[PDB]
Amino acid sequence: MDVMNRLILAMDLMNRDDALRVTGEVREYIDTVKIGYPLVLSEGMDIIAEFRKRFGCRIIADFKVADIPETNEKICRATFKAGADAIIVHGFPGADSVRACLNVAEEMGREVFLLTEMSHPGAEMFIQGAADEIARMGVDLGVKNYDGPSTRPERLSRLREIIGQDSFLISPGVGAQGGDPGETLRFADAIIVGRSIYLADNPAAAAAGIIESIKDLL
């Protein structure tokens, strides 16, 4: 997956007008947008096609899929029908739940990203202790795309170690949550940035600035 400027926009505004305007303002800097439930539950799944029509960006559906296999399959089908290129799935519910998502993705020509450790403080309670095992489970299942935390670079490095250099790794928690763009890109293929861009006075200048700070990383 070739992500322009190694930068994925987390578009978590909850108003169609604002989301479209802000994404338009930063379009020259990105070609990959992560759309999650804040926007989808506010404006509907049709917003995905709207983004493809307006921006011709790739779309990652950040739906944190975390149900039983039967329901996961249905969620993946609905999501890919809406035009998402990829979907983010939790590993904590186990291998069968992940495999259900991999099956649908294969059937519809899409990608699954496995979320192995999360970036927020609460992740330390239960997820962190399972995270290495979840990553190994991903490897066992043939997962090639992973998602891990900018806010703990040593944990992100470990994730990279487990999955190897051939796997693709994206990482949220940059900016607002305290993660550093350049340090994160030591390990991740691409950084995910939400509030630092979409809540900025000037989103375009915010994106431009981030990219300036990592310019020697590409």
Ligand X SMILES: O=c1cc(O)n([C@@H]2O[C@H](COP(=O)(O)O)[C@@H](O)[C@H]2O)c(=O)[nH]1
Segment interacting with ligand X (CB under 6 A) among 49-57, 60-68, 157-165, 180-188: 60-68
State yes or no: residue 128 binds ligand X (CB under 6 A).
no
| Residue 34 annotated in ligand binding | yes
105 lines the binding site for ligand X (CB under 6 A): no
Residue 67, interface with ligand X (CB under 6 A)? Answer: yes
Active site residue 215: no
Question: Would you say 83 and 49 are in contact if contact means Cβ atoms under 8 Å apart?
Answer: yes
Q: Is 19 in the site for ligand X (CB under 6 A)?
A: no
**What's the maximum distance between 2 C-alpha atoms anywhere in the chain?**
45
Closer CB to a copy of itself, 108 or 130, in the complex: 130
Alpha helices in the chain (DSSP H): 16-25, 37-43, 46-55, 69-81, 95-108, 127-141, 153-163, 181-184, 195-198, 203-213
Return the residue of 91, 175, 181, 203 that touches ligand X, per CB under 6 A: 175
131: annotated binding-site residue?
Answer: no
Shortest CB 215 distance to a copy of itself, Å: 28
- The verdict on 41 binding ligand X (CB under 6 A) reads no
d(CA 103, CA 97): 10
Instruction: Look at the chain and count its residues.
Output: 218
CA 102, chain centre distance (Å) = 16
Binding part of the chain for ligand X, among 48-56, 101-109, 112-120, 157-165 by CB under 6 A, reads: 112-120
